[PDB]
Every structure is written in structure tokens, then in C-alpha cells.
Design a protein around this ligand. Sequence first.
Ligand SMILES: CCCCCCCCCCCCCCCC(=O)O
Ligand SMILES: CCCCCCCCCCCCCCCC(=O)O
Lengths: 268, 268, 59, 57, 57, 59, 255, 255
Amino acid sequence: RVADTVGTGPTNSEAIPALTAAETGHTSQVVPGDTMQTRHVKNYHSRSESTVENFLCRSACVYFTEYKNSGSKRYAEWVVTTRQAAQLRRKLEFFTYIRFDLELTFVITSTQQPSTTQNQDAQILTHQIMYVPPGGPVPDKVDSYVWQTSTNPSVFWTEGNAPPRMSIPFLSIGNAYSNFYDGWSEFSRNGVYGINTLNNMGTLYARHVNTGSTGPIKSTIRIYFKPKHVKAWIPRPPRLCQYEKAKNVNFQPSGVTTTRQSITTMTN
Amino acid sequence: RVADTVGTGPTNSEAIPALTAAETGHTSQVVPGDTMQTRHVKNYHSRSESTVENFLCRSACVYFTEYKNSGSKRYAEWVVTTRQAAQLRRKLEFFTYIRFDLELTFVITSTQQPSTTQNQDAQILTHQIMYVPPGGPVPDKVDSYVWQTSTNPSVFWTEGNAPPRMSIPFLSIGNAYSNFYDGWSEFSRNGVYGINTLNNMGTLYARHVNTGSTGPIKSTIRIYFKPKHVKAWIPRPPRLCQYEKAKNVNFQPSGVTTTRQSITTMTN
Amino acid sequence: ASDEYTAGGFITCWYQTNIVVPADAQSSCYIMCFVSACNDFSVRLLKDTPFISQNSFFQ
Amino acid sequence: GAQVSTQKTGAHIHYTNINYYKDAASNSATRQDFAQDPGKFTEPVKDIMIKSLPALN
Amino acid sequence: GAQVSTQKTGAHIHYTNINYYKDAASNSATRQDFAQDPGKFTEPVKDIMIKSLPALN
Amino acid sequence: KVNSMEAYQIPVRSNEGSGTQVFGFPLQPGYSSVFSRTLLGEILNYYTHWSGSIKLTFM
Amino acid sequence: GYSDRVRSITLGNSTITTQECANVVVGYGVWPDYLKDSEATAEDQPTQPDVATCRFYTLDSVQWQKTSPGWWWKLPDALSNLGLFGQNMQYHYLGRTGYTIHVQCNASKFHQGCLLVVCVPEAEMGCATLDNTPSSAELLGGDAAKEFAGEPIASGSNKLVQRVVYNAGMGIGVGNLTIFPHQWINLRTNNSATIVMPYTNSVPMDNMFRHNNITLMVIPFVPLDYCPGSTTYVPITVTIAPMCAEYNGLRLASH
Amino acid sequence: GYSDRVRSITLGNSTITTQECANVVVGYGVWPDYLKDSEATAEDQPTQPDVATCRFYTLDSVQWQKTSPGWWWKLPDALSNLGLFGQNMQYHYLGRTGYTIHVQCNASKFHQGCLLVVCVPEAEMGCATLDNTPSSAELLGGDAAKEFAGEPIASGSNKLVQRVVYNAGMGIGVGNLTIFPHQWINLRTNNSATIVMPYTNSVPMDNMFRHNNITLMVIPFVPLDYCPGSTTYVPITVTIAPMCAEYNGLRLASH
Ligand SMILES: CCCCCCCCCCCCCCCC(=O)O
Ligand SMILES: CCCCCCCCCCCCCCCC(=O)O
């Protein structure tokens, strides 16, 4: 609950709250009462919306890819990593160390591709989503034994009903998801540099179980991340400069802020 | 519960309930018993239907818009405001100050547009509805990063199942939804005048997630408002004159009531 | 966001008397300013920020 | 933690209600609040005026 | 084995929650943890500095 | 001045008069260009509403 | 009694005295402490000298001119070539320590200026070219202060770090750097700045050579000014003292 | 603990901070207080805002040169054209208030000088010519500081006030002005002067327009001196705050 102001009356004392020393590195907490007379106003406002859990707990689309029922690309492959979407990456970059569980929803939408094949009879498409942890086998082809998934987790979904959704625990060899890593892979100090060192989260594949019809059909899958039970450590300043690459923090230098007319202008 | 009449018998007293003074501004509450003999009739009738909650708690369609899978208009934009539908606006105008929560249901219906493209294979259309609060980004195009919705609320809906529905709390910087505002925006007294001053509720966009087929498909979305936990203050007289604009109360003068033959006619 | 119905006010700083210096000392100085919130700050209605944008998925 | 209340039936039977969502703005519409006070709009005068009395003595 | 808790409503009603999955990572997001401690970022100095005092005596 | 460290400095010099103005800006933390890139502003640009006091520390 | 501007600090066999200093800032409210038994992961016995490892090492001094943009230091790298702390972090595999940072810049009553001393944890820095990443010889300078730049670095292919000052190299507003533990040395009042950073990392222990946690940054917000007649060479000195240092995994010398 | 040179004063919505100030002088030992019921004579109800009326109004500043004789202000007249105090004393007939006087003149360590700030009650002033009396446009200057004169004013017929400084205009030795509540602002130590004058008058309430009780006088006993290289424009500011102000006799606007 938000604090409430306390009523105050005219004062004339040597001690002065307003005058302090900002060189100490201390934020001087001054109630409006110190610099002017105030009346007792109770505050019934709450800080409920601000909490880290309510700020980060909203579904956001990390990446979307496409696959075709018949054609050169029959299966889709994506290395599961964040930093591909600016909206979520910026929100996560606020804290150096983060630790959260995750909820994943897959919005799969199909569409017909233009062709010349006649006598089309569309049938309910079925989509299989598979997750390969770092080290497992890779389906070099859309039809391969790897798709048996004797151990890997997978989800099958027929088109027409509610989207798939699963919950994922905190998968990390450390004690927190590091967002920034100022170091190299080799102790030699030569090699991969940056956060891409700590990205070994696996890969996610998707395919069509059954060929829908004779005419070509293209399906696009979108992946949504929902942080749950989130904990944040070491707060950091907000980005400011637009992102360029998804493997590092390389950027182009940009002005501190938008300019105005003069130093006494009240309008942008 | 409705009150019941009390039995009365012939009287001959100086005090007279019927004669009063209407200049005082007081409604003389006279039971039928005062002006004639009455018998004791118990009333089991109830005023349950009249209550403000039961009067305003019925779904009503505020606005409907259209978007096309392929074509110039691929996304729909609507500033969320009331006063576009006469049936609900008239009901709300009864009270100067209103305060209610809201339930929103979106009836999305698609249809095929006439064309010449052959070999059509229709696929389940998916519709995304997004709400941008006042200040957020705007999707200048149907395909844009804004549609990631990292913070904004959104709903995805595949065609074929029950319609979407969400509940919205009381969003207002004041303590009540003002229905009438006799003032300007500028303290200069020149500028926007009327209720349009207090309408900053945001915007609502909608789009097709996946192109359904080769042939053009047009979809229309209707929005329904359902007030919940409603409170009303300062009752007002009913409209009478038909509405003209959705930004003010400008009207064309109309007769008090429909006329009749004479002052002693019993028929319209 | 900007709205004339909820205008904030104006913060202005004015010279009270002067800035006097002794001999052999610079007569042009600088002042810095920090902004912070009081114990009674609150925020509501989370929305997307209009600052960050992406043309395509970074890769 | 269920709430049992009475149903609106004719004159001259309990129903059950459980809240599932934790926002307190998702509850069903409260329809049974049959309370009134017509003293604000009718008879709003400062000095009480009894029914059978010369309103202006 | 149900858990009854309070709803987040305005100022100036209990809701029910039951866990069905046995992994403890499938529970709903805990949204009501309104606890704070701004002493770590603001006023982090070693020696306490009272408000109305010459910060540097 | 926004492309150097001179944006955070407010100039003040020994004048020949008194009562002149040093600086001024509107109270728009989530909108004005002055408070847009401050931590307070960066936090405010995520939420539609705001309320409370403000503390300007001048050094 | 006494005043708050005077402070003395003793560590190992070294002492630091200041007569015009502000209040010490102690990290995020945590004083550095040894690794508890309910948090460790290495089953080997650790070594803790706590005297040779923990002491005030004085680094090289840099000159503060009227057109100096700022300097940055890496705490694990700077002390890697100085004393037994360097020898130990070199002969071991895992290390853990907190640090005490003291910055000394003194000027008379007729000088003016202001410095920001900030300890940024995990300061990943962007390269000048988007495709390449910075090299190990450009990012960290052993017992050397890497200076910043007033104008943007060229975008031509290179392994140079983006040294533009109004972005701090990490791509942020230099104004919002305050969120981290920081001190202000204004030549009007303060003559020194003290910071006490605990061990901030996402693991119990990490290798010092391939991971530099904290990056001290000194930024002159308000430039230095004076009139002819005053001394123009005003240096800046930085003394770093390790605290509660321990190690694990004794291995053959590695450099 | 703390020192006595630092003071903060809050009134209404205004605040005054001083870091090199002497002890406040409180009139003749009486803090201003409202009119008690055993002393009033007007049978009407009084109006007391106590927020808009009571606050620090800052007047116009005057320059202190090497050849400045002094300045005088009338407390009722100076604030007559500033804020609701001016509007109220204009719409009423009887007014009553005490005043807090703050004078601000700051100089470096290399300047020298001394000012006398004295609140003279009932300061009737002699005209330049014996037959005539001073006019209303020469005696009081609304929100303006009337300066004195180093040499005697001409005795030719006129309505000019005798502005000679070594007689203070009232025909007294400027040396004996000390009897009244007074403060010394020496640029060697003091930078500000605070005075608290209660309501001193021979009646419970009096009309402000036709009677100015207190006349603030600033007299530079020791002139200002400096060497070439220091700033030559050293101003003087005066802030007046009403206290315990009340009024009676609401009447149509009168000016
Ligand atoms: C049908 C597949 C189900 C399982 C899919 C799991 C994919 C996500 C794995 C965990 C990723 C957690 C986030 C890592 C990136 C980060 O923390 O920045
Ligand atoms: C998927 C979008 C979900 C959210 C949509 C919210 C749209 C409605 C916002 C609140 C409007 C309340 C009514 C304001 C107008 C009035 O009171 O007259």
C-alpha cells in the first residue's frame, strides 16, 4: 500500500531537510511536508500493478517460422533463444540476473498456396512439435526415425481447436538465467564472446503429420513465452539504442534524448 | 417489496391530505386511502426488475467494422468510445455520473467475396484482437512488429467455436465515468468542447493471422458491452430528440410530443 | 501521454541575487539535476513502450 | 469455500456460487440489491411537511 | 484440499484455488506478493544519515 | 548538445543583472523530451497512468 | 567529538587515510562474506590467506585534462599482474572475492569539476562493427586504464570496442548509470570516493580469467576548469583491495 | 550534531534556506499572534486565510555599488501590488499582520563590506523644505526601493523627502538607529539577515493604505571594496512574509 502524507504547520528551525549532500551517493527522501505546509491526505492507492511478476507475466511472441506440406522446406528448425524480438528482450534486459519458469503457447495457422492442381479435397492438417535438448539427434529430413520421440517431449495438434500450451521449469546449470556475460568461452580469451556463450537451450522442430491435400498448403507457427514465478536481481538501466544482432549487444551510437527549441521552451 | 394499501372508512375531519402546495417543490405522497375508502389488499409484487443493475446489465452492440484477408484494408482500427449506438447511449444518458465494470464479447463472422480465382481451398481463419491504451504504438500496417503484444492485452480466436469474452475493470482517472462535461480542454475556454474532452480510452485493432485461401474473404467483427456492478448518480431527464453526432449532443429541435384531435379526444 | 485535461504545470529556476567569484577563479559554473519519485508514487494500466522497434526478427 | 444464497422465486431452493478468478472484477453481476431511498428526489424539502396539514400555514 | 484466499478489489469476496498437477511448476502465477525494501538501492550508505541533519558536519 | 556530455550540464555565470531565468520545463515525466530518457521516464513509458510527488535534486 | 569527513581504512598491512571524504557506499547493503557450507558446490578444500590476497594495491595514475572523456577498469584483470592475488588467481581454477574501490583526485579551492565513480556488474560492451565482437587486447587492459572517446568509433570492420562516452559502450543512456552503486567526487567538497562491492555473480565460484564481473567506470560529467596560474596536471589514482578471497582447484600455472 | 549557521524557514508554500546565517532576531521578544477577544473593538467577524496571505514574497533587487548610500522600504506599501495580500488589503478596511524580513546579499571571501538592516516603527520623514510636507509619490515606492543621498537635499520649495543618509531622513543620528531590532550582514561572515517584527501600533487594527507602520532601512556603514578580477555586480534581495494576517470591514474595491 502507498504511504500517506502527514499534516504539517509553519516551522522556523536550524535543521534543514532540503539541504543535503548528493556526493555521498544517497537519495534524500523528502516528504512534501518538509518544503511546504501539507494536509493529512490518506492514500488508498496500491503498487499492485508494478510488481516484477505482473510486469513480466504477459504472453509475448519470440519467433515465427513457416513450413510447407509439399516442397523443399517440409519441416522447420529453430534454436530456442530469446533476443530475437525487441519488445520482450528489452523487458528482460532490465535485470542482469533473472530466474523464471515458462509457459509456451503455439499459434499454428495454415493457408493455401496458389497453384494449378484441380480437384482439391482439403483434410484436417495435423501438426507435430518436437523439442531436442542439446546433444540429441536431429531430423536431417521431414521423414526420419528421430520423429518417434521415444524420450523427447512432443505435442500433436489437429487444426480446429484450442491452441497447444505447456509449462517448462527453470532449465539452467547455474542458479539463474544470466542476461549479460562479459567473458569468452576459451580461458585463452579468444573465441565466442558475450551472452552467446550461455545459450545451449536446445532446438525446436515442427512438421506436418499428414499431407493435407494435392494442392500446396503453407503453415506458419508462432511461439509465445509467458514467465511465471519470476525473481530478478541487480537492476540495470534501460536499453535506449535499437538492437542490431541477436547474438550480442552490438549497436549504433544514438543521441541521449530528442531535442527542443531552447533551454526555456515548454514545448517539444 | 412493494408496499400494501391499508383499509380506511368514511371520514369527516378538518385536516385534508389532498390539498397541498406544489410550489414548495415537494411530491405529495397520497395513498388511495386518503381520497376514497379502500380495502386491505396485500401486495406480493416486487420491484426486482427495475433495479439499475438489471436495467443496464444486458449485452448491447456498440460498433461493428470490416477487414479483408487480401486487399487495401487488411486490418481494422476503432477508437473505443460509446455514443455510436443510440439504444445503449440513450440508456446510459439517463444518469449524469455512472461507474461500472464491463464485459466484452466479439462476434466475428467471415464471408466469401465474389471473384474469378479458381481452385479455392478454404482454411480455418484465425482472428487476432489487440487493445492499444492511449500512448502506445500503432500498427501502421497489418504486418508490423507492434502485433507482438509484449505488454498489450490481446485475444486469438479460430473460427468454429464459442465467441471470445473478457472482463474489464473501471478504467478512469476520476472517480466515475462522466457522461456530460460542460467545459473546454484549454483553460483559455477555446478548444475541444463537451464530453469529447474526457474520451481517452484507447484504440482497438483486429486482423487476420493467416490468409485463409486464394479467393478474397471479408470478415466483420461486432463489439458487445455488458455493464457489471453498476452505480449511478444524479438522475437526468430522457433524451427525446434523435442523436446526430458521436462527439457532442448537437441536435435538431423537435416537438414536445405527438399531437391529437382536440383537448377532449380519448384517441390518438 | 499528453492531454490538456491533465496538464501538469511548469518548473522554472530564477537567479536570486547573483553568482559572485573572487579573483583568479572561473565565473562560469555548471549545475546538475537528478529526478526521483517520492514514497507515494504509483503506476497503472501496463502498455507497450513507443521507444523500441524492430523491422525484422534480428538474426 | 462455497457461498450458498437464496433464489428469486414467486410468492404465495438454495443455490451455490463459487468464485474461481482472483481479480474480484470477474465475479458475476450482483442482481439482488433491492434497496431504495426515495427521500432524496421526492419530499427533499428542509422542513418536514406532514401529509394532512396546511402546507403553507 | 482447497485453498481459499482474498480477491484484489477496490478500496473505500473470497476465491477458491485447487492444485491439480503434481509437478509444482504448473501452479498459477503468484501475483499477490506486495513486499518491498528500497533500502538496497536508495540510502545504501554505511553510516545512517538522518533527514534533517548537515549531511557533512 | 544531445550528442555529448554537455546535455546534462546547466550553464550558470556571473551576470550584470538579476531576476533572469536559468531553465524551465513542463511537468510531463512520460512525454516531455527532458524526462523521457530518465529512469523514472523509462519506467513511466510502460504504464498509462501515474500519480505521486517528484523530487528534483540540484547539485 | 569528531567529524564524518575523516576516515581511516586498514586491510592486511596497508592503510588509507582521508580527511575530506563522503560516506562509504556498501554495495547493495551486503558486506562481502565467505562462502557458506549450504551454498558451495566444489567438494575440494579452499585456500584462504586473507592477508597477502587482501590488501590495497595501487594502480597506475591517469591525467585529467579539460578534454578527457572517461576511463574504465576490469577488477579481475587489473590485479592479475600484481602480487600474490595475481599469482593465486593464476595457479587456481575457481576464485571468489569482493572488492573495495578507492579513487583519489585532489584539487585546490580554485578548481572545479565533477567525476562519477560507478561499479557496473557484468558490463558486456558492443563492438564498433555489428558483425565482429571486441578482442581481448582492446576490451581489458592489464594495469592500464582504457580511455573512452568523445565522438562515435568508425563502423569499418575492426575488433575495436565502441568507446563513445554518451553511451558507455554498453548501449545505454550514460544518465541512467546511477542505478549501480556510485559516488560523486566534486572538487568543491569531496576529494575521494570509496565503494564496497560484494561478490555479484550467478554461480558460487567462477574462473577469473574468462569472466570479469565488475567494471569500474570513471566519467567526468562536468569538465575541469581553472584560470592561468594554477597547476594544470591533476592526476587520478585508483586503489583496489580484495576482501574475503578464496580459491579452489589447484592446477599447473596457466597464463 | 548540527551547527547554528544553517537555518530553514517554511511558510505557506514557500521555503527559505540559509547556510551562513546568524541568530534570528524576534522583535521585542514577542512572536506575532492573532488578536485576542479581550482586546478587539470591531464587532464584525474577521477573515483569516493564513496561507495565501502568509508566504514569502520576493521583491525587486537593487545593486550595491561602492558609492551607494542606502535604501528604505514600506512593508504595507511594498506588498500592496503582489498576490492576495494586495487584493485583501485592497478590498477591506481594517488589517492586522506581523512581518518576517529576510535580506540576501552574498559575496566571496575576497569582498568586504557591512550592511545594517533595521525595522523602524512609525518612521515619519522630514521634507526638504520646512514649509512643505513630502508627497505620496516620493515617500513610498510600490515594489521599488527608494535610495538615499550622500549630500543634503536642496532647500528650494519642493515635496522631495530629505534623503540625507547621516540623518536617516527622520532627523536623528544614524548611529543611534540600533535601539530598534537590527541585524548586521558583514560579507566576512554573515550572508543573510532575518528579522521577525510583531504588530506594533497604538490601535488594535488600522487602515494599511493611509498608515505604514514599519519602514525597513538598509544602510551600508562600511563601503564595498574589491580588487580588479572579482565580480562587480553584487545585488541585494529582500523577501517579506506576512504572519497572522486578518482583516475586517469588507468594502467595494478601493485603490
Ligand atoms: C513440444 C516442446 C515442449 C518443450 C519446449 C521447450 C522450449 C523452451 C526451453 C526452455 C527455454 C527457457 C528460456 C531460455 C532463454 C533465456 O532464459 O533467456
Ligand atoms: C482484446 C482487447 C481486450 C481489452 C479491450 C478493452 C476495451 C474497452 C476499454 C474500457 C472502456 C470502458 C468504457 C469507456 C466509455 C464510457 O465509459 O463511456
